[PDB]
From a paper:
The protein Roquin (encoded by Rc3h1), known to bind target mRNAs and promote their decay, has been found to be crucial in the maintenance of peripheral immune tolerance. Roquin binds a stem-loop structure termed the constitutive decay element (CDE) within the 3′-UTR of Tnf mRNA and recruits the Ccr4-Caf1-Not deadenylation machinery leading to mRNA decay. mRNA degradation can also be mediated by Roquin’s recruitment of Rck/Edc4/Dcp1a decapping complexes and is thought to occur independently of miRNA activity.
To gain insight into the molecular details of the interaction of Roquin with RNA, we determined the crystal structures of the ROQ domain (residues 177–326, to 2.2 Å) and a larger construct containing the RING, ROQ and zinc-finger domains (residues 1–484, to 2.75 Å) that incorporated the ‘san’ mutation M199R. There were two copies of the ROQ domain in the asymmetric unit of the first structure, with a dimer interface of 759 Å2. The domain boundaries differed slightly from those suggested by earlier sequence analyses. It has seven α-helices interrupted by a short β-strand between helices 2 and 3 and a β-hairpin between helices 4 and 5 (α1-α2-β1-α3-α4-α2-α3-α5-α6-α7). There are no other examples of the overall fold of the ROQ domain in the Protein Data Bank, and therefore this can be considered a new protein fold. The ROQ domain can be subdivided into an N-terminal winged helix–turn–helix (α2 to β3), followed by a C-terminal helix–turn–helix (lacking the ‘wing’ of the first, α5 to α7). These were preceded by an extra helix (α1) that appears to stabilize the relative orientation of the two sub-domains. A comparison of our Roquin1–484 structure with that of the wild-type ROQ domain demonstrated that the M199R mutation induces only a minor conformational perturbation but one that is likely to interfere with binding to either an RNA or a protein ligand. Although M199 and R199 occupied a similar spatial position, the presence of the mutation (located at the N terminus of α2) resulted in distortion of the C terminus of nearby α3 and the loop that follows it.
Numbering used by the authors: 177 to 261, 264 to 327
């Protein structure tokens, strides 16, 4: 798809990455593993935690690519950041379950598509983000919220 290619180019243009439906899911679940309980990790340590556990099952995982995944979450305003002179990152309380964090994640990607002027329907979103046709109403719901006049 040209559509997919333009979307991911748009995502990369903003310092972010989507690693693919299977890999991104596991990445996000590992972010949760580290931050569920409100632990406060630097970006370095968060990336390290996730790459460490992701790479065994998805060997192409890197500090660079997972940094770009975390940046996507940062851009989605998922973190409470405590600055210091090296900042520490906490998952906002409202996003400490997978479905909630994943929803904010997807929504940020839909915002990016909107910025990039890319018109994408829910069945396409379901393919792009989940690699199935079982997430249409999830994506449609995200779209509805972003399309308030």
């Amino acid at each position: 798809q040209q559509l997919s290619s333009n979307l991911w180019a748009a995502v990369r243009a903003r310092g972010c990455q989507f690693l693919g439906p299977a890999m991104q899911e596991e990445a996000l679940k590992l972010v949760l593993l580290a931050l569920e309980d409100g632990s406060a990790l630097s970006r370095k340590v968060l990336v390290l935690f996730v790459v460490q556990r992701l790479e065994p099952r998805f060997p192409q995982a890197s500090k660079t690519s997972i940094g770009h995944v975390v940046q996507l979450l940062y851009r989605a305003s998922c973190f409470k950041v405590t600055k210091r002179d090296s900042s520490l990152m906490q998952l906002k309380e409202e996003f400490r379950t997978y479905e909630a964090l994943r929803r904010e994640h997807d929504s940020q990607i839909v915002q990016i598509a909107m910025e990039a002027g890319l018109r994408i329907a829910p069945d396409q979103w379901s393919s792009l983000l989940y690699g199935d046709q079982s997430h249409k109403s999830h994506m449609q719901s995200i779209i509805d919220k972003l399309q308030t006049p």
